[PDB]
Design a binder for this molecule. Structure first.
Ligand SMILES: O=C(O)CNC(=O)C(=O)O
Ligand SMILES: O=C(O)CNC(=O)C(=O)O
Ligand SMILES: [Mn+2]
Ligand SMILES: [Mn+2]
Lengths: 9, 385, 388, 8
């Protein structure tokens, strides 16, 4: 479940 | 030394009518002459600060391709890196540096709650984050060096992804447009436009992010509703008939659950307070910090030439109610404004500077002073001579 | 050695019609010859197991009046107890002891999801949790010794509590009714009925608790929705006109936010899956456990054919829903198992009040997908098989 | 002040 780049924490 | 708005020569109404959430836009020299108030070295030191969300992505030269090491870091981590093919990312720099918040004053034709933050990146020669998409509306402001941006004008629906990368990077990417942004340039992208930024040299990028909630993220923010409830109505079934197949959750049961949730959603007063809170709440680990003023000296200091500064514009908003009252939202907290002074809400959240001249009307009111005292003590506003 | 239901002479129709969530009811010898399958020693040992929720309440003889001690405990905690005036409570004993779970088979006229657990209490003379109210429907089953129960037939709307106690006690309590229960007789209370139980001897009380969610409890369970969304609809404003006051969250924005939430709630198939999961999910720190290794489809077919029986470990954590298209979803311990419209008729049978034998499973016993379902359910520890 | 029957 990888998060999008612009997200962060 | 900043334009009243971004968009180059375009007026905001034209931008919002044609480009906003529709198609990309390249604005050459949106900011006529400009450089980062922060240096690459200062950004690096800022990445070491406690509580800051920062990420180091090594395309190559790391343990394995596309390695992602998370902050907070320390100067030790910055010596052992290749001179090429990596990039640093620091979120919420507008929160940390007032000078970057001054850049936030250009995009004020979009509501405050639509703003997330400005994240600043740095990359030496070859450094990149890779080809990817974001659900953000983003203004990519080149602040130093030169970056090669490849994009594709078609928004993507299906996301082809690379397996187990600790990153969201597109498997296939076919660019239809390539540009080379120099300092002052800005590149707007609506949501889900694929883009591939690569540094030609030592460069930084000021990324102004806008975000809007989807159904999952709203559903995940529903627990704050419980805060305004003290229980609320409870499911009851005094009209229950003996259960044939007791394992069944009947349609009548689901009717009541739906009804209970609907009553929660259909109350506009309640929904407004809830949303206004969860949307202004600090998303990541970084909260505001306070310093202790009397109402007397505040009145004096302000009349003596001081100014109030907004530390977090994205975390500042308000809502008008039917009876004339209002609710002000600051960093997750809701302040109830009686209809008498409800008009301070737009003022405290708007474009206009907060000075003695601007605040003259409410300066003599005591409830207004109580509010300013609370906001300054909550870290929402900073008093500046 | 238990009857079909817990109402003795009363019929379910009459009880649900005249009492359920309305009036208290005392039922004498509802459960003839019923003694506790466990003993106070065994109850204490059970309270020493990690992951279990247990409490010791001392009205007097503790460090301070009405002291609460929380488990899991060790045997050293029990020896130091006074000879009188204290109580041991243990939660979810039905999930720890099948003989207690069988007592749950005596209350099946109520849907499974409305059930919470069976709380077993032990108390010597004078032992009590004080006068209090619950939001539970509850059957107070006397299992050993005698207990004096006092109640008040008027429910408590606004509860006036005693400040800082760790246990919820009423400041004022005048009872209009009083009974002394012996092993076998049961006392039903609808929610918010104030009751004061005092053990006359060494006594144990099996409390069959039901619970129904309120708005806050549903709101807090909403994040589970995200499992079935993978994003869903996102708020959008391409037609955004600029920003008179950037601070304002306009009514038009609230409209769309309300529209996005309504879409979640108003999708009945979606709401059915969500509620079914969050309502069958283990409420405390005690989930089920896989046994041995997976019995293959072959062995499962044969073992069941040779006279083996399937047992439901947690009845309160078993439920299902039928959808409009004919498909069904089986809920077990918070997980959702999708059933095709042909295989959907198994859901009532598995979650029902019937015994699961080779005889009752005959039609689907041939089908491969059904065997695969029983595999995964036994694997997750939702069902246990037992030979004869 | 946790409810009495609710446990944890
Ligand atoms: O800073 C970079 O080069 C990459 N940043 C982004 O793609 C972004 O703004 O979402
Ligand atoms: O078992 C006891 O001593 C007290 N328990 C209850 O009143 C209950 O069932 O909630
Ligand atoms: Mn991006
Ligand atoms: Mn009780």
């Amino acid at each position: 479940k990888p998060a999008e780049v612009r997200m962060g924490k | 030394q900043l334009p009243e708005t971004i968009l180059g020569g375009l007026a905001p109404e034209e931008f919002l009518a044609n480009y906003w959430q529709k198609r990309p836009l390249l604005i050459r020299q949106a900011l006529p002459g400009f450089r980062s108030p922060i240096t690459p070295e200062e950004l690096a030191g800022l990445a070491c600060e406690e509580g800051v969300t920062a990420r180091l992505i090594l395309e190559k030269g790391g343990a394995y391709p596309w390695e992602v090491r998370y902050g907070p870091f320390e100067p030790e981590d910055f010596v052992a890196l290749p001179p090429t093919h990596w990039t640093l990312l620091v979120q919420e720099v507008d929160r940390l540096v007032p000078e970057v918040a001054a850049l936030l004053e250009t995009v004020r034709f979009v509501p405050n709650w639509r703003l997330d933050d400005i994240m600043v990146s740095y990359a030496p020669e070859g450094g990149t984050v890779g080809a990817h998409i974001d659900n953000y509306d983003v203004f990519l402001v080149q602040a130093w060096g030169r970056r090669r941006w490849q994009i594709n004008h078609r928004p993507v629906e299906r996301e082809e992804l690379v397996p187990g990368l600790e990153v969201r990077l597109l498997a296939h990417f076919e660019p239809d447009a390539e540009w080379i942004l120099e300092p002052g340039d800005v590149l707007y992208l609506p949501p889900r436009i694929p883009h591939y930024g690569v540094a030609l040299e030592d460069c930084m990028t000021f990324s102004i992010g806008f975000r809007a909630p989807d159904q999952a993220e709203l559903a995940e923010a529903m627990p704050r509703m419980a805060a305004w409830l003290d229980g609320g109505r409870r499911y009851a079934d005094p009209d229950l008939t003996p259960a044939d197949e007791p394992g069944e959750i009947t349609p009548e049961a689901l009717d009541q659950i739906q009804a209970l949730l609907r009553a929660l959603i259909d109350d506009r007063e309640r929904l407004a307070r809830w949303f206004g809170c969860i949307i202004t709440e600090p998303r990541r680990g970084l909260p505001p910090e306070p310093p202790p003023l009397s109402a007397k000296q505040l009145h004096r200091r302000l009349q003596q030439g001081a100014t109030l500064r907004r530390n977090a514009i994205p975390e500042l908003a308000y809502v008008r109610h039917a009876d004339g009252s209002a609710t002000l939202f600051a960093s997750g907290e809701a302040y109830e404004l009686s209809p008498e002074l409800a008009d301070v809400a737009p003022l405290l959240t708007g474009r206009r500077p907060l000075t003695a001249e601007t605040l003259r009307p409410w300066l003599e009111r005591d409830d207004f002073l109580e509010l300013l005292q609370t906001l300054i003590h909550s870290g929402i506003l900073s008093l500046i001579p």
